[PDB]
């Protein structure tokens, strides 16, 4: 009830994460990116087609269970 499960996909790598709904998305952004050795800012993350700010929290975006976050390479 207090946490949230989210799927991050770039069309090639899809990974599930579980985070607090009151914590910034940044951790989820970083762990996914740093797995590939890239910086977080070298990747654009979209929820419903809208860029996600790092300081944003899941409850700020009305995120639901088993929601999907799209990842795209920048530049």
């Amino acid at each position: 009830e207090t946490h949230i499960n989210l799927k991050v996909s770039d069309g090639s790598s899809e990974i599930f994460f579980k985070i607090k709904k009151t914590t910034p998305l940044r951790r989820l952004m970083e762990a996914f990116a740093k797995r590939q050795g890239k910086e977080m800012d070298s990747l654009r993350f979209l929820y419903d087609g809208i860029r996600i700010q790092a300081d944003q929290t899941p409850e700020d975006l009305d995120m639901e269970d088993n929601d999907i976050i799209e990842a795209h390479r920048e530049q």
């Binding site: 946490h3 599930f16 579980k18 985070i19 797995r35 050795g37």
Partner: protein, 157 residues
Amino acid sequence: DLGKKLLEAARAGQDDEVRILMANGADVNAEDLRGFTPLHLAANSGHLEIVEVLLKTGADVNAQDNYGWTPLHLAAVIGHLEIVEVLLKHGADVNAKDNFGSTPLHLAARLGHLEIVEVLLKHGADVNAQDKWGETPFDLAIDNGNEDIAEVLQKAA
């Protein structure tokens, strides 16, 4: 498609289908283009029984994906205590480093999973482990606002 069906069955929790493939001779160590093995998707999806079945059949508990992530990493990122314990009891490397130095303790500290951090420390997680960015799990915990988690990491000195 003995392999490709096994990974699909491992995710979404098709325990009966996974049993069917593995009883029909499917390779439990099959890989996709991302380096993921059926144990990987079973652990990342929080499917405990399927993880136990795969481990009992002989799945590589330390299998590395395309970037060195093990099933322990994918279990720690979702904070699944049971699967972590099962993998640790089945030989999973607690201090496994991916291609860029990220350990399961690092991911648990960054994502904010106190129980996973405590269990990894109980099983011998390296506090002094440094990623390619030179950050110990304490640094990630104090970075991402996870202060109470950084308390336990500091106590392990």
